[PDB]
Structure 1
Amino acid sequence: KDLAMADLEQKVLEMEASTYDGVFIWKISDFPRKRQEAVAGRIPAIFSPAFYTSRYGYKMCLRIYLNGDGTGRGTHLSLFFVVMKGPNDALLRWPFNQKVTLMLLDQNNREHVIDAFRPDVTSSSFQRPVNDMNIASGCPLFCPVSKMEAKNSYVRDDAIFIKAIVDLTGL
């Protein structure tokens, strides 16, 4: 009944959110609420649906901490990139070595928060996955909390937009 319908509804959800061109835009609604759950330690982080570099490419997802993680715990919004175990990993080049640009979109489209980084391939974060997800890599100090919590353009109508762009050069 449930391990029944539940699983099917989840598949459809994942399918509806997936992209296959290395470009993902993640709309996080109910910002205010999710924000406090983070601040209170109840739900520190959120995973995004999966997306890919190409139809049969790398599988990836984002991981965000509204009240921060690591060196940014309690002071910054922390945003991470996660390499997942993909159905076609046996056909891909490992380690993962594509530039990844992470963004928090300014809804007035004037000043987006942006961090473009090239993986340091020596990190285990980029090796071929053995588990469902590799260790995340990314930006612990992506965005100071003050920018997304009173007085400005990133939060609008209780929602924010996170964008990821995986550079496909070499693929």
Structure 2
Amino acid sequence: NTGLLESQLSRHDQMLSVHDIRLADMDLRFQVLETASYNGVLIWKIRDYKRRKQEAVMGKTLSLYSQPFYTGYFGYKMCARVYLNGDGMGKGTHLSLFFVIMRGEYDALLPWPFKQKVTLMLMDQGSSRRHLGDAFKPDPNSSSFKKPTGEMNIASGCPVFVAQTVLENGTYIKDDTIFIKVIVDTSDLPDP
């Protein structure tokens, strides 16, 4: 029927639209693992600064988060978040970056609140290798390190990590891309 076949052709396109959508996700899902780390360390490669920062001012995309990375095959699921233009105390002036804890399929056996030592740092692609970064022993009383309720706990860092100025004028921006690094302590935490 020049009308029945019509339904079938559409039932296929519809479903077709779907796979495409899934195949889409999967195309990404890979990338995560591909770039995930199980030793409490991380290297966030943020490509397309100029554009991506610009967006940060126009306020279309204020921040991006990193790939979830952990601290042992079955430890804390965590990741970073950065505000290129800055958040609150450094908006428009600096760049802000924070460490975040996500709901992890194995949080049920891990200690809480999170207590391990972090260590944030923006790598220097120049030859002077003078990377920048600070660290801290997570204060317990804060809602940032409890036992995760939803997707990811509350952010935490230093809105004024580095001055946009100092940044853009140092040897860190290269090929319109840069590397942030996080370092969660894992020694003072026996493993399985």
TM-score bracket for this pair, using the shorter chain length: over 0.9
Matched residue count: 170
CA distance in structure 1 between the aligned counterparts of 2:119 and 2:31, rounded to whole angstroms: 25
SS in 2 for 1:9: helix
Shift of 1:111: 1.7
Contact 1:17 1:50 in 2 (8 A): no
- Aligned identity (percent) is 56
TM-score for the superposition, normalised by structure 1: 0.95
CA distance in structure 1 between the aligned counterparts of 2:145 and 2:87, rounded to whole angstroms: 20
CA distance in structure 2 between the aligned counterparts of 1:72 and 1:130, rounded to whole angstroms: 28
Change in Cα spacing, 1:109 to 1:88, as seen in structure 2 (3 Å) is farther
Shift of 1:57: 0.5
Shift of 1:109: 4.4
Of the three residues 44, 57, 60, the one matched with 2:62 is 44
Highest Rg: 1 or 2? Answer: 2
Shift of 1:4: 2.0
Structure 1: stretches of 5+ with no match in the other structure: none
Shift of 1:166: 0.5
Shift of 1:148: 2.1
Contact 1:103 1:113 in 2 (8 A): yes
Q: Render the CA deviation track for 1:105-135: whole Å, top value 9, x for unaligned.
A: 1112432111111111100000011100111
CA distance in structure 1 between the aligned counterparts of 2:140 and 2:162, rounded to whole angstroms: 24
SS in 2 for 1:168: coil
Structure 2: stretches of 5+ with no match in the other structure: 1-18
Matches within 5 A, 1:5-154: 5-107=23-125, 108-149=127-168, 151-154=169-172
Shift of 1:3: 4.4
Shift of 1:39: 1.6
RMSD: 1.1
Write the letter of the residue equivalent to 1:99. Answer: K
Write the letter of the residue equivalent to 2:174. Answer: R
CA distance in structure 1 between the aligned counterparts of 2:56 and 2:36, rounded to whole angstroms: 25
Q: Which structure shows the bigger proportion of residues in strand conformation?
A: 1
Contact 1:64 1:78 in 2 (8 A): yes
SS in 2 for 1:91: coil
Shift of 1:14: 1.1
Moved over 3 A (4+): none
